[PDB]
């Protein structure tokens, strides 16, 4: 099960020159503060999310500032971004900056919702507090890069609700007194957010922490041969084998999904199966006691049938949209209100603004405008609602169809409600900038194929890492060669 | 007819070795001695039956107590003379009964102490010693120096053997000054079994009573003085859910009460005016004020202001003006900062010689900042910062005499008192605590104290030394968790109630005592 295991965040915090400046002019202080946030906002995610973080390395500018900082957190957030991209080559699963100016804003930070395992929307950015303050602001900014939100249908209408009345929640405001804990709510949603496929690359578990090693701290460092969470938890997994983190002779493994009773459990023996469509199931290599890296099927792959296109390991659809944006009762609309709508180029459907007018939409990027969904509440899952609803009846040979749709704000250049970048419109066809273009438009990367036009050469499915995953009676990096009986 | 155990001439006797006083003396005897004798104390109401006496003298004996009217019966009695001898304590009334007594002298037994007034009720008296005596200076000699003083008898000098600080001083060379004999203390009247955060005061009806918030079950507590054989009975409750500061204001003999809380915190009440239930008025807008962690009363130029302090970052501080039907929004301040405490004071801007009214929040991260009242446009409009301190939790102020100080909290630092100048305020005292969530300066009947509480260890109470000019330690108070400390005055009684965030609060008595006495 997805939700039972135990996952692992890489974490790199990049301190800018104010931080640095903050303490000491020092780099050791800016560290062991940075770390001690770290540790905090750790002990929050281990008991709540059953997820750890993991700081695999840091930067901290001494010289100057690279970029332009702003009040704004989301401009801040998107600069950072580009130089991390621009220039960052670390190995991470996310990048935060701790900044030493005070932003103006009703948020202590921002960080790109579901963006965890990207190298675009891999991070985000906190402002300067103290160790408990920042260590919430880092909390909540992972939080939206993991999936989680703080508003919904069911907590404003009260079915979901922070348990705590003296002190917050995490996605909650933070006032003097900080919140200890997650809403139920939320942990339901980081659920739903791994059962949608995303957040592959948190299953890596790291062998190697930036600070000296330690004994019964839950690792594997340098020295030490094995290692289980506590001596006293060692117990239930470890203890016939780790001693003194080290194993005898007749231990293999110490503890993790391919290990039982301190003995390597056979290669091809299936750790974890595929959560979706988008998902490659993995099978234990007899190596290591931790199931194998998490992989996912290639961008470009279809899920869900033809009905979507695979990104980072999860399905994008329409229908898939509707149910994100305006809840789960929600259901996509027939074609037929998408087609009627567009043509007429009205507030109720259109395929975008350019300047305070509407276009109309070519016949081809009927499904790539204004996103139409039927039943629709008064409130959307998440951001405010801009402008009101849209509810527009077709009737068809006696069928009535309400398509209701809705402009849903969480950055001033990001608008819900339009079709997401990548949301197939037709066979072989992909929506971007709400317009209909091949996929060859979209210069997909592919894996080593032998036998031309194929994919691993039909034999196997390609990867996001660009490595194929070969079928059974197939092996080879492009799955050419043949098993000794078929 | 004179004792075997005395050496008697016609009217002298001399006793040596007695153990017990005799009661039989011949008729003609005048002058009685006690040398060496084996006396545990004086015989209690001694010396009866023998009224000749004239003089009576004690040399080289023994005595631990000197009993009350132990020298009655004695209405001839002229010298008596006490002297040579090892003795700890005397009664005060000892010497009563006497009004014929002329010359006495106490002197070289070794006296450390002498009871208030021993020499009361003998008019009569002439010469007196006290000489050779080693004499614990301390308000006991106070009296005897008022003593020295003021009678007519001549007395040879006296000097102080103690303390090692006032050493061969004379006794009748000193005056009021380095003599404190009036001591203050806190010692706890009641205990009470709800822990609390804010208390705070009001005045009605010649009633007083005492509004305490208790965040967790959220109780809003008012109680008064019960004036029947009780310290404090609580009357009234108002339950919010998650209180912080609970407020009380009272405009035109109307009472107010304004209550905090995380959700749906903003809200002000009305206590009508019979059946004394209060009722709910006013709900302030969730959306604007989140998480306030204050509140503080103040009235400007014939209008009431109120002030709420928001620790969150989206919520603006707000200032809100009252009309006649209630509070509305007035300013706004410290935009997306996070304030944990304001405080409002009145001081003297330079050159005006009037006071102008201010303000004085303290934020999370930042350092504090003051407000100048503009009463031309109705708001604040110098905004400034007072430098070189930082982590700011709190600010208090009080007024000595003239001058204005204020007394900032920090956490884990150095607390410290400023002077108001001029223009800024100057550096006063740097006083170290360790874990202090609140600086309570306190002015009760002309002593200025000040509070500084700990989470960890005692609480440091401080005294205003008027000479130095600087506090001084002066009592450790034990508080699990203390908030807040407020000063309650009830008719000729003087209390302060000390909340407990993690414990049962505490009521403590103030008590003021007199050593001379
Ligand atoms: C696992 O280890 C074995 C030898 O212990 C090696 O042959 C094999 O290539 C390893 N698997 C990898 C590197 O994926
Ligand atoms: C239109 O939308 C409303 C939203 O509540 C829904 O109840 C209704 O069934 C829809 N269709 C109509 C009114 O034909
Ligand atoms: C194809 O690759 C080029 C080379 O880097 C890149 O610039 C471009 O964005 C890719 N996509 C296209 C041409 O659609
Ligand atoms: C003498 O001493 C007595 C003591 O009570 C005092 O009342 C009186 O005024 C004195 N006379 C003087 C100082 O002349
Ligand atoms: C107010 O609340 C306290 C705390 O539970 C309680 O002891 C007291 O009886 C209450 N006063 C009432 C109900 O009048
Ligand atoms: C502002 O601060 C200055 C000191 O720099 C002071 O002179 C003035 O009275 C304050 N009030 C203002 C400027 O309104
Ligand atoms: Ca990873
Ligand atoms: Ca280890
Ligand atoms: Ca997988
Ligand atoms: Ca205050």
């Known amino acids: 099960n997805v939700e039972e295991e135990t996952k692992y965040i890489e974490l790199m915090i990049v301190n800018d020159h104010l931080m640095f400046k903050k303490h000491r002019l020092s780099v050791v ?29 840091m930067e901290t500018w001494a010289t100057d500032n690279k970029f332009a900082i702003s009040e704004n957190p989301l401009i801040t957030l998107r600069e950072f971004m580009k130089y991390r991209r621009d220039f960052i080559k670390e190995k991470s699963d996310a990048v935060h900056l701790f900044s030493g100016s005070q932003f103006e804003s009703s948020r202590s930070g921002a960080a790109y919702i579901g963006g965890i395992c990207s190298l675009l929307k891999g991070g985000g950015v906190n402002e300067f507090g103290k160790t408990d303050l920042m260590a919430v602001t880092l909390a909540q900014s992972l939080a939206h890069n993991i999936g989680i939100i703080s508003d919904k249908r069911k907590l404003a209408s009260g079915e979901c609700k922070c348990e705590d009345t003296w002190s917050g929640c995490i996605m909650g405001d933070t006032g003097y007194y900080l919140p200890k804990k997650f809403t139920q709510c939320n942990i339901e949603e980081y659920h739903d957010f791994l059962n949608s496929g995303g957040g592959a690359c948190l299953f890596n578990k790291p062998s190697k922490l930036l600070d000296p090693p330690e004994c019964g701290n839950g690792f594997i460092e340098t020295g030490e041969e094995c290692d289980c969470g506590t001596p006293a938890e060692c117990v239930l997994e470890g203890a016939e084998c780790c001693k003194k983190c080290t194993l005898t002779q007749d ?7 391919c290990c039982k009773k301190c003995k390597f459990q056979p290669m091809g023996t299936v750790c974890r199966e595929a959560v979706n469509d988008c998902d490659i199931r993995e099978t234990c ?20 049938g033809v009905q979507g296109i695979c990104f980072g390991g999860r399905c994008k659809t329409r229908d898939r949209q509707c149910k994100y944006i305006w809840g789960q009762k929600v259901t996509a609309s027939d074609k037929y209100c998408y087609e009627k709508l567009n043509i007429e180029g009205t507030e109720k459907g259109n395929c975008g603004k350019d300047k305070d007018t509407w276009i109309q939409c070519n016949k081809r990027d009927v499904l790539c405008g204004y996103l139409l969904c039927t039943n629709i509440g008064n409130i959307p899952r998440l951001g405010e609602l801009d402008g009101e609803i849209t509810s527009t009846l077709v009737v068809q040979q006696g069928r009535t169809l309400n398509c209701s749709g809705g402009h849903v704000k969480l950055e001033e250049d990001v608008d819900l409600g339009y079709v997401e970048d990548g949301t197939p419109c037709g066979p072989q066809m992909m929506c971007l900038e709400h317009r209909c273009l091949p996929v060859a438009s979209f210069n997909f990367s592919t894996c080593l194929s032998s036998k031309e036009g194929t994919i691993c050469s039909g034999n196997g499915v390609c990867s996001n890492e660009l490595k194929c995953v070969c079928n059974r009676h197939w092996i080879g990096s492009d799955c050419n060669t043949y098993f000794p009986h078929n | 007819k004179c004792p075997a155990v005395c050496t008697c001439t016609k009217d002298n006797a001399l006793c040596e070795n007695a153990r017990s006083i005799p009661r039989t003396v011949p008729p003609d005897v005048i002058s009685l001695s006690f040398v060496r004798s084996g006396f545990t104390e004086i015989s209690e109401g001694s010396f009866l039956f023998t009224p000749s006496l004239q003089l009576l003298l004690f040399t080289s004996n023994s005595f631990d107590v000197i009993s009350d009217d132990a020298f009655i019966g004695l209405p001839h009695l002229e010298y008596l003379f006490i002297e040579n001898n090892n003795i700890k304590s005397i009664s005060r009334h000892t010497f009563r009964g006497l009004k014929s007594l002329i010359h006495l002298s106490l002197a070289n037994n070794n006296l450390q102490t002498l009871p208030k007034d021993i020499f009361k009720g003998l008019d009569s008296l002439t010469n007196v010693d006290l000489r050779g005596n080693s004499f614990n200076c301390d308000c006991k000699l106070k009296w005897l120096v008022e003593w020295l003083g003021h009678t007519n008898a001549t007395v040879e000098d006296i000097y102080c053997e103690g303390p090692p600080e006032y050493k061969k001083r004379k006794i009748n060379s000193l005056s009021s000054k380095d003599f404190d004999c009036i001591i203050t203390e806190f010692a706890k009247s009641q205990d009470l079994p709800y822990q609390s955060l804010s208390i705070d005061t009001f005045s009605y009806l010649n009633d007083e009573y005492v509004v305490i918030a208790q965040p967790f079950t959220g109780k809003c507590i008012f109680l008064e003085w019960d004036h029947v054989e009780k310290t404090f009975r609580n009357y009234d409750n108002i339950t919010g859910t998650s209180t912080v500061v609970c407020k009380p204001i009272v405009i035109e003999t109307q009472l107010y009460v304004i209550v905090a809380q995380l959700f749906g915190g903003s809200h002000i009440y009305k206590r009508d005016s019979f059946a004394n239930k209060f009722i709910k008025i006013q709900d302030i807008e969730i959306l604007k004020i989140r998480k306030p962690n204050d509140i503080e009363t103040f009235k400007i130029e014939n209008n009431w202001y109120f002030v709420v302090a928001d620790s969150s970052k989206a919520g603006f501080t707000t200032i809100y003006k009252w009309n006649g039907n209630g509070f509305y929004s007035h300013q706004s301040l410290h935009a997306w900062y996070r304030d944990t405490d304001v405080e409002y004071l009145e001081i003297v801007r330079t050159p005006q010689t009037l006071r102008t009214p201010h303000l004085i929040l303290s934020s999370s991260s930042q350092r504090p900042v003051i407000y100048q009242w503009n009463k031309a446009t109705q708001l604040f409009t110098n905004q400034t910062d007072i430098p070189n301190m930082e982590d700011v939790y709190a600010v208090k102020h009080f007024s000595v005499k003239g001058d204005v100080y204020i007394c900032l909290t920090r956490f884990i630092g150095d607390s410290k008192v400023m002077k108001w100048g001029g223009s800024s305020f100057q550096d006063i005292q740097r006083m170290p605590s360790r874990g202090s969530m609140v600086f309570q300066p306190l002015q009760i009947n002309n002593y200025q104290y000040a509070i500084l509480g700990s989470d960890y260890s005692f609480t440091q109470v401080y005294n205003w030394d008027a000479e130095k000019a600087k506090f001084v330690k002066f009592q450790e108070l034990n508080v699990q968790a203390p908030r807040s400390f407020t000063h309650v005055s009830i008719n000729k009684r003087n209390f302060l109630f000390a909340s407990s965030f993690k414990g049962n609060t505490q009521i403590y008595k103030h008590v003021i005592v007199d050593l001379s006495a």
């Open chain 1, 285 to 304: 290599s007899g190596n290591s006691s931790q199931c194998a890296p998490n992989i996912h099927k290639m961008d470009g792959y279809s899920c869900d």
């Open chain 1, 29 to 57: 202080h800016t560290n062991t503060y940075a770390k001690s946030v770290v540790n905090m906002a750790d002990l929050i995610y281990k008991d709540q999310l059953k997820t750890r973080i993991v700081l695999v390395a």
């Open chain 1, 251 to 257: 231990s293999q493994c110490s503890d993790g999904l």
